[PDB]
Design an enzyme around this catalytic site. Structure first.
Site, PDB file in Angstrom:
ATOM      1  N   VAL A 137     -23.783  16.038  -5.021  1.00  0.00           N
ATOM      2  CA  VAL A 137     -23.774  17.145  -6.243  1.00  0.00           C
ATOM      3  C   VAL A 137     -24.123  18.164  -5.589  1.00  0.00           C
ATOM      4  O   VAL A 137     -25.437  18.627  -6.068  1.00  0.00           O
ATOM      5  CB  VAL A 137     -24.636  16.407  -7.192  1.00  0.00           C
ATOM      6  CG1 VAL A 137     -24.613  17.255  -8.633  1.00  0.00           C
ATOM      7  CG2 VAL A 137     -24.667  15.297  -7.731  1.00  0.00           C
TER       8      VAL A 137
ATOM      9  N   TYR B 245     -33.186  12.797 -11.607  1.00  0.00           N
ATOM     10  CA  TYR B 245     -32.992  13.776 -10.246  1.00  0.00           C
ATOM     11  C   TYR B 245     -33.989  13.734 -10.234  1.00  0.00           C
ATOM     12  O   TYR B 245     -35.098  14.124 -10.528  1.00  0.00           O
ATOM     13  CB  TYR B 245     -32.374  14.272 -11.549  1.00  0.00           C
ATOM     14  CG  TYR B 245     -32.054  15.906 -11.134  1.00  0.00           C
ATOM     15  CD1 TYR B 245     -31.640  16.108  -9.943  1.00  0.00           C
ATOM     16  CD2 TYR B 245     -31.849  16.798 -11.929  1.00  0.00           C
ATOM     17  CE1 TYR B 245     -31.834  17.314  -9.395  1.00  0.00           C
ATOM     18  CE2 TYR B 245     -31.659  18.494 -12.035  1.00  0.00           C
ATOM     19  CZ  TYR B 245     -31.792  18.520 -10.495  1.00  0.00           C
ATOM     20  OH  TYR B 245     -31.210  19.739  -9.931  1.00  0.00           O
ATOM     21  N   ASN B 246     -34.161  14.138  -8.528  1.00  0.00           N
ATOM     22  CA  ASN B 246     -35.276  14.158  -7.560  1.00  0.00           C
ATOM     23  C   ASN B 246     -34.959  15.830  -7.291  1.00  0.00           C
ATOM     24  O   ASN B 246     -34.828  16.075  -5.870  1.00  0.00           O
ATOM     25  CB  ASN B 246     -35.619  13.737  -6.881  1.00  0.00           C
ATOM     26  CG  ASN B 246     -36.695  12.802  -5.879  1.00  0.00           C
ATOM     27  OD1 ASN B 246     -37.701  12.993  -6.830  1.00  0.00           O
ATOM     28  ND2 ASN B 246     -36.620  13.267  -4.289  1.00  0.00           N
ATOM     29  N   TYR B 247     -35.771  16.476  -7.563  1.00  0.00           N
ATOM     30  CA  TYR B 247     -36.203  17.750  -7.289  1.00  0.00           C
ATOM     31  C   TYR B 247     -37.201  18.338  -6.632  1.00  0.00           C
ATOM     32  O   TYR B 247     -38.284  18.426  -7.575  1.00  0.00           O
ATOM     33  CB  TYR B 247     -35.112  19.261  -7.993  1.00  0.00           C
ATOM     34  CG  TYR B 247     -34.861  19.689  -7.591  1.00  0.00           C
ATOM     35  CD1 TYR B 247     -35.133  20.496  -5.891  1.00  0.00           C
ATOM     36  CD2 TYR B 247     -34.178  21.527  -8.477  1.00  0.00           C
ATOM     37  CE1 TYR B 247     -35.015  22.607  -5.625  1.00  0.00           C
ATOM     38  CE2 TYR B 247     -33.093  21.865  -8.089  1.00  0.00           C
ATOM     39  CZ  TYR B 247     -33.495  22.858  -6.517  1.00  0.00           C
ATOM     40  OH  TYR B 247     -33.448  24.097  -6.084  1.00  0.00           O
TER      41      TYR B 247
ATOM     42  N   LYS C 188     -29.468  11.723  -7.921  1.00  0.00           N
ATOM     43  CA  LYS C 188     -29.266  13.307  -6.903  1.00  0.00           C
ATOM     44  C   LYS C 188     -30.458  13.382  -6.718  1.00  0.00           C
ATOM     45  O   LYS C 188     -31.221  13.738  -6.844  1.00  0.00           O
ATOM     46  CB  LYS C 188     -28.934  13.607  -8.476  1.00  0.00           C
ATOM     47  CG  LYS C 188     -28.786  15.170  -7.835  1.00  0.00           C
ATOM     48  CD  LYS C 188     -28.061  16.460  -8.710  1.00  0.00           C
ATOM     49  CE  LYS C 188     -28.675  18.142  -8.291  1.00  0.00           C
ATOM     50  NZ  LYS C 188     -27.971  18.892  -9.302  1.00  0.00           N
ATOM     51  N   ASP C 189     -30.536  13.191  -4.857  1.00  0.00           N
ATOM     52  CA  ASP C 189     -31.804  13.857  -4.355  1.00  0.00           C
ATOM     53  C   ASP C 189     -31.244  14.852  -3.675  1.00  0.00           C
ATOM     54  O   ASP C 189     -30.557  14.765  -2.119  1.00  0.00           O
ATOM     55  CB  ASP C 189     -31.620  12.519  -3.503  1.00  0.00           C
ATOM     56  CG  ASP C 189     -33.197  12.602  -2.831  1.00  0.00           C
ATOM     57  OD1 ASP C 189     -33.584  13.441  -3.099  1.00  0.00           O
ATOM     58  OD2 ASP C 189     -33.842  12.675  -1.147  1.00  0.00           O
ATOM     59  N   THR C 190     -32.042  16.162  -4.418  1.00  0.00           N
ATOM     60  CA  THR C 190     -32.063  17.551  -4.145  1.00  0.00           C
ATOM     61  C   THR C 190     -33.243  17.494  -2.825  1.00  0.00           C
ATOM     62  O   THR C 190     -34.293  18.162  -2.837  1.00  0.00           O
ATOM     63  CB  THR C 190     -32.084  18.277  -5.024  1.00  0.00           C
ATOM     64  OG1 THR C 190     -30.827  18.239  -5.994  1.00  0.00           O
ATOM     65  CG2 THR C 190     -31.424  19.758  -4.519  1.00  0.00           C
TER      66      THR C 190
ATOM     67  N   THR D  86     -29.671  21.517 -12.876  1.00  0.00           N
ATOM     68  CA  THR D  86     -30.523  23.138 -12.403  1.00  0.00           C
ATOM     69  C   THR D  86     -29.073  24.318 -12.052  1.00  0.00           C
ATOM     70  O   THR D  86     -29.529  25.070 -12.858  1.00  0.00           O
ATOM     71  CB  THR D  86     -30.703  22.968 -10.719  1.00  0.00           C
ATOM     72  OG1 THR D  86     -31.784  21.912 -10.987  1.00  0.00           O
ATOM     73  CG2 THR D  86     -31.323  24.429 -10.925  1.00  0.00           C
ATOM     74  N   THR D  87     -28.212  24.492 -11.964  1.00  0.00           N
ATOM     75  CA  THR D  87     -27.267  25.202 -11.570  1.00  0.00           C
ATOM     76  C   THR D  87     -26.773  25.885 -13.175  1.00  0.00           C
ATOM     77  O   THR D  87     -25.957  26.551 -13.533  1.00  0.00           O
ATOM     78  CB  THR D  87     -25.746  24.664 -11.296  1.00  0.00           C
ATOM     79  OG1 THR D  87     -25.915  24.260  -9.736  1.00  0.00           O
ATOM     80  CG2 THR D  87     -24.551  25.402 -10.476  1.00  0.00           C
TER      81      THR D  87
END
Ligand SMILES: [Mg+2]
Ligand SMILES: [Mg+2]
Lengths: 288, 288, 288, 288
Positions: D193, D129-131, D153-155, D42-43
């Site tokens: 992350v 990648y969970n967002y 990676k869990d945001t 995302t970044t």
């Protein structure tokens, strides 16, 4: 780090409060290390209790301990004030209230005026109870800076939210109210107000003692078991399950919750006990 | 097409219900064309009213009309049953309740068992009050299929949700509870339960009459104005603003709401009246 | 009242666009009364289409009709501008874009700047596509008053929201984008952009014609059937189901959607057709 | 405990990726103690990058390090597979993707089939990648149990949700993606992350080192400051603000983000720098 218990309110099958069981339960929790009791909170069915039931809960517990925080919220400020005036004459730790609830779209100034009225008459330390998922409102620091806040119980799964109070309100004690974040609260805030202290108090007191000794891995393992329990209890109704589990783990009867918070049927209670059995053994193995 | 009013509960300065003003108000509403009264609803401060207060509102209104829907919900099923047994003795339109509220994460079966108990004891037609924004729960048609439901007041901004009940529950009367969808409800459902009937009853009655004459543009025009009012009221607290507008528009005093539903200050009231004045003119021009 | 179709984009099994099927499909929809085609919208998999695929869709459809609104949104404003410059040289009804998407927490000024850039270069009428459930942003009138907006497609289940544009943006054409609210849009807004026009165009055109004749009951009955279909399609994926249903109801192959919008398997497609059969008969009985 | 950076993608004024600046930036991060790089996150403007741009970022970074997690998500599974086949030829840490996005109401099986296809063709470890705040979907552990997942990676602001993956997926490495929970992640998960590693890498590395020495108070103190920064950045657009801060804190130019992710104007940049200055001093005092 303090471990505060939002104590359950025992009822008989007719929906009448049993104060003897309440006192027996409180004595046991205190003997096992619980630092204070949050009376008439969500776990204690606060909003379901009448003005007089909230008062009788405090009186009964007042024959056992002085370490009491008295939650007095209702949808009639006159009744709230009557409970604040009543508690002014007693030696307790503080008075508390969650925000106005049910009615959506109330202007923020209403929340402010509500708390200002409690602050104007109370002679006890004020504990703000912030529970957005229940009331529909998040009390922002904007309003808290104006009030004489001593502590805040923040029920929110976002620890950054609880941590924001610590930073914006110098000197205020902040406690997070989730059983699934105890480990993190014990490492960043002033304590926790966790419903699970009703049936596994020794476990939560052990977490804090382990953290005090620097044994974080051990405290995290206990947290993992706690989070598994929380996940199992959801399908039954977390508050309702607690009554059955207090009896299971602590060995005394605390009765039943009162409908609409329906008690578990015999089958549901037996089903619950089967699911949690492996977690029991593993918990009692690490905490004895 | 039924126009139902969730009548406000008049309180005096001390927070005591004024039943004479309740009767004067109800009588005027009926004369202006309101068809039925939803007693102890959200606009009536239902959840904030004690068991006794809910009962006296019904007794008072009964002298004026029998087209009464008695809202009895509370967080103690025993008190709910007591109100249901009481109302069984009277000749009314029906008995209603919103779902259990405050406590989040209650299992769906709890909601089902709550309504089952009301039905088991009630001798009146059951009216389900669905207000997810307030209670935190949406009552799905699946739970209603087993109950003897005669009516549903659905406060939801999604008209398709209201229409869903119609489709899945044959013979059930469905009424939408939003002031901002009145026009659409009068063109698809069985009626409306709109809080604005308290102060602009003739406007809402005129919308239905215009629609029945095929003058939709005129009815839609009145809706635009209503929706502009709704925007202005939000800032002051919609329920609280209604008390001030009833006096403005209808000519008699209905007192004040009761804190935490704070009354508008004199400054706020004067500010509200100036802000709605242009809209009041456009209204009184299209509704002689 | 206009009936605009957000046309699907036919793909072959390899995920390549089939423009012949797109033209065949468009001709049929137009012959049956559809007033304009919204190209590269959600139903047309807009955000899943490359810059060149969006361009090729317009070119193909441009060989069939001039009644086209060209949706050009992507996460690179350079690509969006290239599509606006490309479309400037063609005779179409307008250019459109939904707001920036995916990234949460973008400041409101970003949304404003995005549209200002499109407005600065486009020589076609601007159609704002507001779809909050998809983009994460609700474009408020505050920003629209500054832009030269000709029309707005508002996808929102709250009709009061679509109606608010009509009131705050004088002269702007407002269309609601939900299949479950068509009846209400046809009685209050300037039209609809409904995905279901892809397979039951005659039904939606019949609704408007019935409303034009004052036969609202009949138009509401058609809406009830539409809402039942919508409810059945959810479990399969509404967009994916549409491909199967176009073939079912219209008699020509439109291929498949492109993964992640997975096509229905043979079994799923057969299961779908069985569920909708009763609704088919009842629809063809009222519309033939 | 791994400190992973979702590296920004440097663009020039025209919106063309500047890979030399990407390499200079990555090299500095590694020297300051960052352990791995999440590419096209995302970044990094992942979803806004074309298929080719995602590929070139990986090629560029590969010259600097092989500790690369290659994010490949897009709304066309064919393009995703093409990137997966390409990366199979290279020596990297793993391949990642966030879930399908934009399209709401997709069935859960669609999400499952998307990840199944990546797994079927990939020869690298899969990082989920969970967002949810960005994609509109939460990937539950149940879907992950069948896939060869090595990392997640869990945001998510709820640490219990991140811990849930740990508990239900044995052997899987879990990293939380929130800057405001770094402290807690370093005390319970496998790493973080965090987007702030782009401009204050030494601060985050210092938190881990302080924690490893048992100096939690010092690490928690650094978290307070980080959270105050996060509040300030929101107003400007967090990703856009990072580009300006990388130059400030690290001394080299990483260009600009690409619209709709608008770069800060010179006025905005100067305003940001003044606002964070007091915090920058407190930071550079605790992190020499
Ligand atoms: Mg005593
Ligand atoms: Mg041509």
């Amino acid at each position: 780090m303090e471990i505060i218990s939002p104590i359950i309110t025992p009822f008989d099958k007719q929906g009448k409060v049993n104060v003897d069981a309440l006192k027996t339960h409180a004595k046991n929790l205190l003997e096992k290390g619980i630092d204070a009791i949050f009376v008439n909170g969500t776990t204690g069915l606060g909003p379901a209790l009448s003005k007089d039931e909230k008062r009788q809960n405090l009186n009964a517990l007042y024959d056992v301990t002085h370490k009491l925080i008295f939650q007095v919220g209702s949808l009639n400020l006159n009744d709230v004030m009557e409970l604040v005036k009543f508690s002014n004459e007693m030696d307790i730790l503080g008075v508390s209230s969650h925000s106005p609830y049910y009615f959506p779209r109330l202007p923020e100034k209403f929340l402010a005026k509500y708390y200002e009225e409690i602050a104007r008459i109370s002679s006890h330390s004020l504990y703000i109870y912030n529970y957005p998922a229940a009331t529909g409102y998040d009390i922002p620091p904007s309003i808290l800076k104006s009030l004489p806040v001593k502590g805040i119980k923040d029920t929110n799964q976002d620890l950054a939210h609880s941590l924001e109070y610590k930073l914006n309100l110098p000197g205020v004690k902040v406690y997070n109210g989730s059983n699934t974040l105890i480990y993190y609260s014990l490492l960043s805030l002033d304590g926790v107000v966790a419903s699970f202290t009703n049936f596994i108090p020794e476990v939560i007191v052990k977490q804090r003692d382990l953290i005090k000794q620097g044994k974080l891995d051990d405290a995290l393992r206990l947290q993992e078991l706690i989070n598994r329990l929380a996940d199992i209890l959801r399908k039954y109704g977390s508050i309702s399950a607690i009554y059955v589990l207090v009896n299971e783990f602590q060995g005394y009867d605390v009765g039943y919750p009162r409908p609409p918070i329906f008690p578990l049927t015999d089958e549901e209670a037996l089903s619950l006990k089967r699911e949690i059995e492996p977690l029991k053994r593993k918990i009692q193995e690490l905490v004895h």
